[PDB]
């Protein structure tokens, strides 16, 4: 019965990673946010979630962090957002990396779905025991 919690945590974590990848793709060409700061790319942090003491368990998303990767600089001095040298900070989104993240998250999502289907069938069949 714990397997439902484990696989549901896995599905939630992969959904969060997919949403972060979609957010990175959407704002690859973004210039500014609601304030004057640029869009720093997001990445989720996966951890092992074992509420009891048995070492292993499901995966949990501890936090969403902004990659410390350097900000791309484009020479646009007429933009009011430019600094003293006339450069504007554009995000450092890795397009190929984010597409690969999307596809890999999708595949892991399906694997967890298949696991849930199989174990649900087994737990339905165990109620038949000797009757």
């Amino acid at each position: 019965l714990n397997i439902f919690d484990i696989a549901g945590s896995a599905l939630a974590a992969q959904s969060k990673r997919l949403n972060v990848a979609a957010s990175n793709l959407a704002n690859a060409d973004s210039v500014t946010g609601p304030d004057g700061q640029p869009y720093r790319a997001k990445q989720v942090v996966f951890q092992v979630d074992a509420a009891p003491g048995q070492a292993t368990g499901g995966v949990k998303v501890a936090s969403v962090i902004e990659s410390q990767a350097p900000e791309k600089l484009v020479y646009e001095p007429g933009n009011p957002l430019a600094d003293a040298n006339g450069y504007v900070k554009m995000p450092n989104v890795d397009v190929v990396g984010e597409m690969v993240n999307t596809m890999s998250a999708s595949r892991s999502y399906q694997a967890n779905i298949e696991v849930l289907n199989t174990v649900k069938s087994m737990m339905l069949k165990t109620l038949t025991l000797g009757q």
Binding site: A12, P34, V61
Partner: peptide, 20 residues
């Protein structure tokens, strides 16, 4: 608390402003 736990108090409303 935990992102998927149970609390008795409603989550605060979420709004997305264009500029702050």
């Amino acid at each position: 608390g935990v992102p998927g736990a149970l609390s008795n108090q409603p989550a605060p409303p979420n709004e997305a402003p264009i500029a702050t």
